[PDB]
């Protein structure tokens, strides 16, 4: 009973100087393989982030393997949320506030593929 989900309903908030992305999981199960897909046209100023026990660093376009997600027992409506700051987690200047509008208004979107066990 393997079900693959591609989630692209990432909503964005902020806490202080840092961006907070969030996507909802519509079915429970045990993740066997997860990967985040970053699509963008503008530089992300070496923004580091955390998602699903995984450290990545989005500079431009990239598809990161969410390594630490293998085995996460998710539930219905469990919100996967992570934090992201530019300059290797230093949040220097209004960069992250710019990178925010690159997420809310398109030009930078996330794509969450999950290989679960339902």
């Amino acid at each position: 009973e393997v079900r693959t989900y591609t989630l692209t309903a990432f909503s964005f908030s902020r806490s202080g100087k840092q961006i907070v992305f969030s996507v909802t999981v519509p079915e429970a199960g045990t993740i066997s393989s997860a990967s985040l897909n970053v699509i963008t046209q503008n530089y992300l100023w070496n923004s580091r982030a955390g998602f699903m026990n995984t450290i990545f660093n989005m500079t431009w376009g990239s598809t990161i393997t969410l390594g630490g997600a293998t085995g996460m027992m998710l539930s219905k409506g469990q919100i996967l949320s992570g934090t992201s700051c530019s300059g290797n987690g230093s949040c220097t200047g209004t960069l992250d506030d710019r990178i925010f509008n690159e997420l809310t208004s398109g030009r930078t979107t996330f794509t969450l593929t999950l290989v679960m066990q339902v």
Epitope: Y43, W45, N46, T59, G87, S90, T92, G93, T94
Partner: nanobody, 120 residues
Framework: QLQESGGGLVQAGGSLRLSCAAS????????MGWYRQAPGKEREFVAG???????YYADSVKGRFTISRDNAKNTVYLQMNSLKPEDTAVYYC????????????????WGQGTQVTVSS
């Protein structure tokens, strides 16, 4: 002061070699990328290289183009092969200061933009 060199109208299947002129040491170990922009189209990504000499290409230019940089020359190259008529656009070169002991918000400085055209 950023600036581009190379480019100009070439026929389909031709090749061009753009070079980016980074004026000063402010650009050493700095992430720099290439962008194109046609009339009626917004600025689209093309190719980029990080300080660690990585490679970040677009999809419409994957495998056809090739980016690189000579870290000592302060020059980023974009080798364009198998050129198609959609590649006709002003090719701008952008660099991004990654906390080079700056003061204000590390802005995004660009070049002026060399012209590239592909005829049938």
């Amino acid at each position: 002061q950023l600036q581009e060199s190379g480019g100009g109208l070439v026929q389909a299947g031709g090749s061009l070699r753009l070079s980016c002129a980074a004026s000063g040491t402010i650009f050493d170990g700095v992430d720099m990328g290439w962008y194109r922009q046609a009339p009626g189209k917004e600025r689209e990504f093309v190719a980029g290289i990080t300080a660690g000499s990585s490679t970040y290409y677009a999809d419409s230019v994957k495998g056809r183009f090739t980016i690189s940089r000579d870290n000592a020359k302060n020059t980023v190259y974009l080798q364009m092969n198998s050129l198609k008529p959609e590649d006709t656009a002003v090719y701008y070169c952008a660099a991004y200061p990654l906390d080079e002991i700056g003061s204000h918000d590390p802005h995004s400085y660009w070049g002026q933009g060399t012209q590239v055209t592909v005829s049938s």
